[PDB]
């Protein structure tokens, strides 16, 4: 029974940067893969980025490619998403979710969630 905590969000100007953290409770975080996804009001939820359980191998959505970077320190038991040069269409509730057992990302079976950090990009 693993519990996740989101942090790092808030409000940022147009073109700015913001870094996101997500911490997991209990061991066997190394055994689970991690993937950040965002959801905006009215709009449906969009899978942002993903990192393998062992790390090193990463995937991103076309929209955030070349702009964001996902990373993880298993020793710290934490995952990170650095969002360099944010756009106004990035304003959403970002969630961090653990997934052991999926298919090609975005198709993963996420079987643990987090609280959720609100990110607001002002025009």
């Amino acid at each position: 029974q693993v519990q996740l905590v989101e942090s790092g969000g808030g409000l940022v100007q147009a073109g700015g940067s913001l870094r996101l953290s997500c911490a997991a409770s209990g061991r066997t975080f190394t055994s689970y893969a991690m993937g950040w996804f965002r959801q905006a009001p009215g709009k449906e939820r969009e899978s942002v980025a993903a990192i393998s359980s062992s790390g090193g191998s990463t995937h991103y959505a076309d929209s955030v490619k070349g702009r964001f970077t996902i990373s993880r320190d298993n020793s710290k038991n934490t995952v990170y998403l650095q969002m360099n040069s944010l756009k106004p269409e990035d304003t959403a509730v970002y969630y961090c979710a653990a997934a052991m057992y999926g298919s090609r990302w975005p198709d993963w079976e996420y079987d643990y969630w987090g609280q959720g950090t609100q990110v607001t990009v002002s025009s």
Binding site: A50, S52, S53, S54, S57, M100, G102, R104, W105, D107
Partner: peptide, 11 residues
């Protein structure tokens, strides 16, 4: 081989 997008992917 390496399962391209799968969670427990080994590089």
């Amino acid at each position: 081989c390496r399962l391209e997008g799968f969670p427990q992917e080994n590089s």
